[PDB]
Every structure is written in structure tokens, then in C-alpha cells.
Paper text:
Holliday junction resolution is a crucial process in homologous recombination and DNA double-strand break repair. Holliday junction (HJ) is a four-way structured DNA intermediate formed during the homologous recombination. Canonical HJ resolvases introduce two symmetrical nicks across the junction center by functioning as homodimers, and exhibit strong structure- and sequence-specificities in HJ cleavage. The RNase H-like enzymes, including RuvC and MOC1, typically feature three or more conserved carboxylates, known as the DDE motif, in their active sites.
First, to prevent spontaneous cleavage, the crystals of MOC1/nHJ complex were initially grown in the presence of Ca2+ ions, which were subsequently depleted by soaking in an EGTA containing solution. The structure of MOC1/nHJ complex in its ground state was determined at a resolution of 2.0 Å. The inspection of electron density map confirmed the depletion of Ca2+ ions, which were replaced by water molecules within both active sites. The overall configuration of catalytic site closely resembles that of our previous reported free MOC116, but differs significantly from the Ca2+ bound state, particularly in residues D115, D117, E174 and E257. These observations thus suggest that the active site configuration has been reset to its initial ground state following the depletion of Ca2+ ions.
Residue numbers in the entry:
A (entry chain A), B (entry chain B): 109 to 271
Write the structure that this text describes.
DNA sequence: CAATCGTGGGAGACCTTTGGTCTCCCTGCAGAT
DNA sequence: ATCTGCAGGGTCTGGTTTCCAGACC
DNA sequence: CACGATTG
């Protein structure tokens, strides 16, 4: 009945689907940090864990998380940060009682027919709006594709289908 | 009082110092994982959380953790893994109730007079043997430097000094 | 704040002290015992 | 099982597959 | 994707 979806990146999000069909999606909490004398964004460990502790999803609920798979052409910092986000979320989810299933981007994109798209981010928001019409206003912006990815991971995990 | 030290990497370890002077150190739990058709060690998230939950250190105890600082010349996989281990430990520690204080390796090495050695791993084990003589048997092997780093991080936060 | 674009990048602590100097890991995989 | 050495590296799902093709942040 | 930077 309950399913969680997590886009773990800095502009990512967590989506919670209840058995009555309602849904919530939360932007990933972050803070601004100093590194090598510049500012950078970092996930907010305590707010994530606090977020997970107030969810109504019971222990045992499966959380489907986007598998970390950076391109070899991405910088060493890209690799560090996606590795870090992944581990922070995985530990946080496990410590808060949820079962964690990593899902490759190719898996849920094939499942919703999103593969090989020229506008993959827009498409993911369009698909999330169709599957979660009451979230349509929370998906209007280009920067909301993180919210879309989370909802689509949860929708994948629940076995939802597009019309 | 109570202090925790964490070497977060795959051969790392967590050390726990109690107020009566006694000490425990545990090797970091790991599992073997298939990745891109080869086998790789990865930290064991469940076992880490379970270990933290069995510690007698009370809530709010400070956990000193080695800051992740990979070299610009380490490969992107190096960056991903150290980022991943760091995030996994930080979240496990916050979620289990401990305060987290990252410590740069240069900080506890300067504190114990270990800067600029040509056998830094052996030296770290030697220093932790002197600080924790009842752990001397658990530091015999060169692969035990991670146990030594965890113990020294904890010794740093407790303010211990070498004779 | 929201978008977009192009390339892929250390970070840290203390000093010489408002910028300079110098220090620091680890992963992943072959091979030897 | 422990260690030594050395350069710094994608990974993943469908292939009704035996390593390939194509795909992804 | 992250990391900078620019542009309304």
C-alpha cells in the first residue's frame, strides 16, 4: 500500500504514495557550505532524518531510490557529490525503518516510455503530472523535475501505468 | 566522558571510549557487491546502524569522523567511494543520536606529532598502541591502521596525550 | 528566484598571516607469498 | 589471509545473452 | 549530475 520514491540529488526530492491514492512530494533539504573558499550546496542530514521521522508510511515500506551512476566525463567532484548524496539518503532511509531498492534511471524511463527523449526533464514532469494530477501545480517549473523523478520512482514501485 | 572516533572508509573502523578509560574498536562492516561485472567492497548500511544502536555511549555523545579529502590525482571512483562512505556514516551517526564533528587528517596527525612520516600507517598503529595498550594485540597487522585511525580520532576528542 | 549554458573542477590548517605554504588521504586491481 | 605495488579507472538493462548494444545522470 | 557563471 505505501511506496516511497527518492531522487537523492541536491535538487532532488522524496515522494510518498499512500494506499488511499494521495501523495506527497518534498524538496530535498539542503544547506550552503564553505568548501575551498567557495559556497556549495549540501543535503541537510538532520532535516532529512527529521522529514523521514514524521512520515506516516509504516516501517517496512519500500523506498525506491535513483541508482547513482555518474558519467565518466563528469568531474571528480560530481562523482564525490552523487556518491555522498546516495550514501546519506540510503543510511537515512535504512535508519528510519524503510527498505531500500535502488532503481536505475533506464529502468523507470523504459517503464514509462521516456527513453531516448530530446526533452527528458520536461517529459518526466509531464508524465508525473499525468500520474499525479493533484500535483500538477507543483510540477509547473523546469526545476521541478526532481519532484517528478521522485514521484515516478514511487509510481514505478507501485506499478502505476499512464493512460 | 564518552567519545566516538570513526574512520569511515572500507578498511575503516569505529572506536568507542568510555569514561572509565576502557575502549572498544570495531572494523567497519562491509559486503561484496557486483558492479560493472566486477566485485567490490561496500560498507554494510544495516550492520553499521545496528552496531551504533548497540553502543553504550549515550545520546549526544560526540563522534569525531575523518573528513573526506580525496586528492585531485585520485580517480573518480576514489572520489565517489569516499563521498559515499562519508555520507553513509554521517547519516548513520546523526540518526543514531550522536553529534558529528568532522576532523581533518592533518589535525589529529599534528596533534600526535605524526605529520610528514614515511611510514604513516605503521606510526599511527604505534601511537594507538601506546594510547590504548590493551588494544596492542588488535593492532599487530598493517591492515589494522584503520582501527588505529578510529582510536586516535577518539583520543583526539577526549584530549588524551602520548607519554 | 528561475532558467540556461558548457565543461568536468581539491581541500585543509597553520604561517610566512588578509594570501602563502605545505600537508593529507583513499580506490581498484594485479601479483606475490 | 595479509601485503605490496601503482595508477587513478562507468555503469546499467535488455540481450531469451555467454559479451554485445544501447542507454543514462 | 555538479560546478560556475550569466540572464531575465
Amino acid at each position: 500500500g505505501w511506496v516511497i520514491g527518492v531522487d537523492p540529488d541536491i535538487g532532488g526530492a522524496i515522494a510518498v504514495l499512500s494506499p488511499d491514492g494521495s501523495s506527497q512530494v518534498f524538496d530535498n533539504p539542503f544547506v550552503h557550505i564553505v568548501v575551498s573558499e567557495v559556497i556549495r550546496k549540501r543535503l541537510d542530514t538532520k532535516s532529512i532524518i527529521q522529514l523521514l521521522r514524521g512520515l506516516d508510511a509504516p516501517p517496512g515500506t519500500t523506498a525506491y531510490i535513483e541508482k547513482s551512476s555518474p558519467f565518466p566525463t563528469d568531474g571528480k567532484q560530481g562523482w564525490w557529490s552523487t556518491g555522498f548524496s546516495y550514501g546519506l539518503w540510503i543510511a537515512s532511509l535504512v535508519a528510519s525503518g524503510f527498505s531500500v531498492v535502488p532503481i536505475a534511471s533506464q529502468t523507470w524511463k523504459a517503464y514509462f516510455g521516456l527513453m531516448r527523449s530530446e526533452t527528458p526533464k520536461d517529459d518526466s514532469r509531464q508524465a508525473a503530472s499525468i500520474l499525479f494530477p493533484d500535483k500538477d501545480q507543483s510540477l509547473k517549473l523546469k526545476k521541478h523535475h526532481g519532484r517528478a523523478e521522485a514521484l515516478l520512482l514511487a509510481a514505478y514501485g507501485k506499478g502505476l501505468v499512464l493512460p
